[PDB]
Amino acid sequence: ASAPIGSAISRNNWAVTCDSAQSGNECNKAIDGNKDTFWHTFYGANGDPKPPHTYTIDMKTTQNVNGLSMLPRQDGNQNGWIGRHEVYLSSDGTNWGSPVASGSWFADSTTKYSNFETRPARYVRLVAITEANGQPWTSIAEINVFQASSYTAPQPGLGRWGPTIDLPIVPAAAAIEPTSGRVLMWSSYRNDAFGGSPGGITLTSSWDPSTGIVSDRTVTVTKHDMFCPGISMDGNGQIVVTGGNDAKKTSLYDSSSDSWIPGPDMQVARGYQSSATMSDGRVFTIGGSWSGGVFEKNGEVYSPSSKTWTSLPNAKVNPMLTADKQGLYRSDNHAWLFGWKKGSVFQAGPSTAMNWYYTSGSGDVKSAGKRQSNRGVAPDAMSGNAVMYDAVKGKILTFGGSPDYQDSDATTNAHIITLGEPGTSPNTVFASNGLYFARTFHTSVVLPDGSTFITGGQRRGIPFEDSTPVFTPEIYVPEQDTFYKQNPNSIVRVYHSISLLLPDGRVFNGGGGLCGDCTTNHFDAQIFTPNYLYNSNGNLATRPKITRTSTQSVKVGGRITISTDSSISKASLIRYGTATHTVNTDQRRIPLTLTNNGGNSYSFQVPSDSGVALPGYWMLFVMNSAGVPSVASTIRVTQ
Ligand SMILES: [Cu+2]
Ligand code: NA
Numbered sequence: 001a002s003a004p005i006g007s008a009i010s011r012n013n014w015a016v017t018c019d020s021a022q023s024g025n026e027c028n029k030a031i032d033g034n035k036d037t038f039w040h041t042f043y044g045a046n047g048d049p050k051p052p053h054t055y056t057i058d059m060k061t062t063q064n065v066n067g068l069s070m071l072p073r074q075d076g077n078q079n080g081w082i083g084r085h086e087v088y089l090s091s092d093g094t095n096w097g098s099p100v101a102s103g104s105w106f107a108d109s110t111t112k113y114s115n116f117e118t119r120p121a122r123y124v125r126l127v128a129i130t131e132a133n134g135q136p137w138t139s140i141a142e143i144n145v146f147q148a149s150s151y152t153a154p155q156p157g158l159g160r161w162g163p164t165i166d167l168p169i170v171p172a173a174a175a176i177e178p179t180s181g182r183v184l185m186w187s188s189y190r191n192d193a194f195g196g197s198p199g200g201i202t203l204t205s206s207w208d209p210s211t212g213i214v215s216d217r218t219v220t221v222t223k224h225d226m227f228c229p230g231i232s233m234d235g236n237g238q239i240v241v242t243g244g245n246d247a248k249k250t251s252l253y254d255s256s257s258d259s260w261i262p263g264p265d266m267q268v269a270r271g272y273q274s275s276a277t278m279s280d281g282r283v284f285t286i287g288g289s290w291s292g293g294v295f296e297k298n299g300e301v302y303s304p305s306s307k308t309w310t311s312l313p314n315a316k317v318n319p320m321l322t323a324d325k326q327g328l329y330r331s332d333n334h335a336w337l338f339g340w341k342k343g344s345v346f347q348a349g350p351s352t353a354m355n356w357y358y359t360s361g362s363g364d365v366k367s368a369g370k371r372q373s374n375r376g377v378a379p380d381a382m383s384g385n386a387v388m389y390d391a392v393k394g395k396i397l398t399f400g401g402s403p404d405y406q407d408s409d410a411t412t413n414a415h416i417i418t419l420g421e422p423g424t425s426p427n428t429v430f431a432s433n434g435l436y437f438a439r440t441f442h443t444s445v446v447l448p449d450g451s452t453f454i455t456g457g458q459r460r461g462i463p464f465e466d467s468t469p470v471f472t473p474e475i476y477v478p479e480q481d482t483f484y485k486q487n488p489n490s491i492v493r494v495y496h497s498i499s500l501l502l503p504d505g506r507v508f509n510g511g512g513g514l515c516g517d518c519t520t521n522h523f524d525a526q527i528f529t530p531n532y533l534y535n536s537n538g539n540l541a542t543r544p545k546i547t548r549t550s551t552q553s554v555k556v557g558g559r560i561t562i563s564t565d566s567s568i569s570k571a572s573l574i575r576y577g578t579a580t581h582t583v584n585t586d587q588r589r590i591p592l593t594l595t596n597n598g599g600n601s602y603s604f605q606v607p608s609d610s611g612v613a614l615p616g617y618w619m620l621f622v623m624n625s626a627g628v629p630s631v632a633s634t635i636r637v638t639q
Contacts, residue, residue, distance in 0.1 A: 001192070002521045003113045004067045005490050006146035015058040020049055030055070030140045038073045038141045040080060051131060053138035057124045057145065058093075065089060065124060066490055067115040067146035068101075073139045074109060080139025081107055081132035084214070085166065087114045089121040096125060103166030103207070104214040106191050106523070107132035115524060116164040117490050118148045148490070156538050157531055158487040159473075165525040168216050169205050171511040172496040173580035175231065175239055178617035178634055179255040181503045183207045183525075185510070186219075188227035188245060191523070193516040199246045202226040207525070209502055222251040222262050227514075228290055230273040231578040233586045235281015235615035236304040237636070239578060242285060243270040247292030250302070250309070255617070267311040268297050275302075276337035276345050276585040279611040281639065284345045284359055287317050287332030294328050299363050315363025322351045322380040323403070330405040336386035336398065337585045341611030344422035348396055350382045356422050366423055371398065371415055373430035378413055379403050383461065383581070385444045387452045388588040389478060391612045394419030397431060397452050397476055402440040402461045409460050410440035414476075414483075432481050437470045443499035443582060445507055446589045447530060448572050448621040448629040452476045453486075455509055455528070456493030464515040466492040473528065491526060498579040501587065503619060503632040505533060532627050544568060544624045546633045553636040556615075557608035560635070564600045566624055571604060573635065574619040588614065606637055613637050 011031045018027035018039065025040035042049050072081050087101040101114035114126075124145050128138040154160060170192055171185035186204045188194040200223045205216045219226075225245035232240045239253035240263065247270060250263030266285070269292025275285040283302040289295070299315030302308070317332050324330040336348035337357075345357040346368070354371055358364035371378040384401020388394075396417040402408035414431035435454070442457025453475050459468035471488040489509075497512040510525025535541040548563040571594055577587035590613060592604040602622075607613040619632035 001110060001517050001519060002523060003115050004069060004146050005115050006066045006148050008144050009059065009063055009147050013060050015060070017056045019054040030143045035071065035074050035141055038139050040139045041137050043137060048136040050136045051128055051138060053128045055126045055128070055140065055143065059122055059124065059145065062091065062120050062122050063145070064118050064148050064151040065121050065145060066118040066148045067113060068124065068126065069144045069146070070112045070126065070140055071142040072109050072112070073141050078133060079135055080137045082112070082128040082138060083107070083132040084129035086127040086129060087116070088125040088127065089119055090123040091121055093123060099163055101164040101166055102212050103524070104168050104216070105132070105166060106168040113523070114164060114166050115491055117162045118151050120151055154487040158485070159531050160529045161487060161489045161526055163527060165207055165214065165510070165527070167205055167214060167510070167523050167525060169203050170496065170514045170521050170523055171205065171498055171525060172227065172514045173229065173231065174498045174500055174510070175253070175578040176500055176502070176576045177206070177255045177258065178576045180258065181209060183500060183508055184253065186226050187514060189225050192514060192521045194227045194245060194514060195516065197225050197245050199225045209504060219260050222249065222260050224249040224251045226251060228271045229580065230270065230275030230285045230288065231580055232275040232277045232283045233576060233578060233616045234277055234283050234302070234304045235639070237617060238304065240275060240283045240302055242266055242275055243273065243288060244291060247271055264307055264309055266309045267300050269293060270297055272333040272581065273297070274335040274337045274583050274585055276339045277614050277616060278339045278343050278345065278359060279341060279614065280343055281615040284339070284357065286315060286357065287320070287335055289329050289332050297332060299357060301359055312359060312363025315357050315359065316365045319353055319355050319365055319367060320347050320351050322382055324380070324382065325404045330382065333405065334383065334581055334583050338388055338396065339611065339614050340419065341422055341609055344611070346419060348386045348398055348417055350384055350401055351380055352378055354417070354426070358422070369425035371417065371428055373415060373428060375430050378415060379411070381411070381413060383440045385442060385454070385582055387444055387446050389446045389450050389452055391588045391590050392607060395478070399431065399435055399454065400439045400442055400457065406461050406463055410438040410457065412438050431476065432483055436474050436483055436485055437472060439470050441494045441497065441582060442470065443493070443497055443509065443579065445499050445501040445577065446574060446587055447501065448505055448574065448623060449532060449570070449627060450478050450572070450589060450591065453507055453528070453530065455499060456497050458494045463495040464513065464518055464520050466494060466520050469494065489526060491522060491524070496581070500577050500579055501574060503634070505530070505621065505629045505631065532629060541626065541628045543628055544622055544630045546620065546622055546630050549633055552634065553638065554606050555638050556606055556610045556613045559603055559605050561597070561601065561603045562622070564602070564622060567600060568594070568602060568622045569625050570623045571602070572621050573606070574621060575614060576617045576619060586616070610639055615639055
């Protein structure tokens with residue numbers, strides 16, 4: 001079940017207009033207050049008019065709209081369930097503009113929602129583009145429009161939230177498909193639940209930024225229910241999805257062919273582990289006591305070339321365990337892993353103790369000291385995020401989290417960890433004065449300019465409950481060592497939420513929930529457009545364009561020559577991300593040292609060390625004098 005952030009508006013003086021309506025199933029039948037009566041389009045008489053089918057509402061007066069509900073027909077018939085749709089808002093009548101919400105709803109009889117940012121409007125319009133099973137009809141039992149307590153205009157210069165992407169599933173896990181630019185998302189065996197799973201099935205969904213289309217696919221070929229996994233993009237360009245509900249399995253997502261192919265079983269059955277891509281393109285994983293048993297689960301490595309998993313039992317999980325009250329079940333979860341030089345993997349936390357993991361032979365571990373500063377020793381920070389914003393200088397920003405997985409207060413603790421060579425204890429200092437808001441279950445992404453966008457979460461970690469939410473996102477700016485509050489959103493993004501950087505420089509933030517008949521399932525996502533895409537007038541700024549590239553595929557140490565349409569000041573390489581349960585071990589940023597060839601022609605070198613420039617797919621962004629980035633050019637980095 002689900003959402004809607006506000007209170008229902010009075011349906012007394014409402015004037016409703018439909019494009020098609022039968023006798024006995026009129027347009028006004030969707031606002032009467034009965035769940036047994038319904039609106040239905042032409043069937044039998046006047047033939048069968050195929051969708052788009054429109055439902056326009058006139059609320060007579062200006063209301064602070066933040067959502068809508070659509071209750072399907074409750075008579076047991078499927079004819080009319082809305083699939084693809086769009087929600088529009090207006091103040092006059094024929095100046096709708098862009099949709100405030102768009103996407104696809106699941107094929108069932110449950111109440112569907114479209115939750116979006118507050119915007120004053122008099123007219124609301126629900127366009128039903130398709131029917132859930134491809135039939136010509138559209139039927140709504142009850143349609144309600146929701147309102148917020150008040151409207152506060154978004155502050156100029158602090159970004160913008162919107163539109164909302166309505167989804168058929170709760171996106172508890174996600175990844176960008178680099179070759180196509182689409183967002184791949186997945187839930188479990190069901191769209192809203194995981195408990196009582198027979199295994200072997202994952203419901204996936206995708207969203208295309210260029211088309212706006214949301215499609216779904218049932219994945220059974222890999223015999224893996226991919227809820228609660230380790231996720232990593234290997235050097236061969238495939239997403240390694242490990243364990244979870246089906247603890248011993250591995251699933252490989254290939255972006256170029258848009259398909260899922262079976263991977264070899266892991267040596268140790270895991271759930272909630274973090275996996276990290278290494279310097280040689282291999283994938284390292286450790287811990288994960290959510291599924292497959294609760295015991296000491298040491299490291300293991302995946303080789304893409306041989307298609308094997310090999311145990312590294314001496315890469316001990318013991319030194320990275322948090323002091324979690326629930327014990328080993330939680331203490332080895334969601335490690336802040338980063339692939340580094342010479343096959344090593346840095347573990348930045350969540351435990352106070354940081355460690356170096358080695359992958360040669362049967363593995364090894366060496367203490368990297370405690371995450372600390374002049375303010376003291378940093379406590380365990382489960383569900384705290386870690387972002388490598390400057391891989392060349394080995395800079396990692398860590399923030400938030402709580403001592404225990406649940407029933408624990410989040411903190412404002414933030415640190416900057418500076419990596420040196422493997423085996424050396426990194427320097428750690430506090431980041432500014434920490435976060436503005438204490439948050440756990442929050443998500444983050446590194447932006448083109450080196451800044452880290454932090455969003456969602458709650459002050460006290462209570463899974464599946466939308467209590468003590470943080471609506472105001474923050475951006476950390478390294479050059480200034482300062483956090484900045486951005487414009488707030490209206491949707492709670494707590495446990496099971498995700499954030500990914502899109503190729504267009506915007507942030508995709510979604511999910512939260514996945515508990516079944518609970519009221520906290522968020523079958524959606526929202527787009528955050530940062531300030532760097534806006535001019536001083538509050539309109540979308542002119543973006544510099546990468547007119548030509550010498551090559552799309554490059555080896556570490558190699559050069560790329562580009563041509564632009566205007567002068568460039570800075571450039572960056574951002575590794576494509578993957579996300580689940582606050583973990584994103586794939587994203588990282590490399591600031592590029594540019595050589596000006598003149599005539600808007602620039603050259604740069606991809607770092608020689610594959611521990612910095614992790615093999616895989618990367619986003620090339622160029623920034624002008626005003627700081628406005630281009631859309632990304634997809635670059636494949638090999639060894
Ligand atoms: Cu979970
Ligand atoms: Na009705």
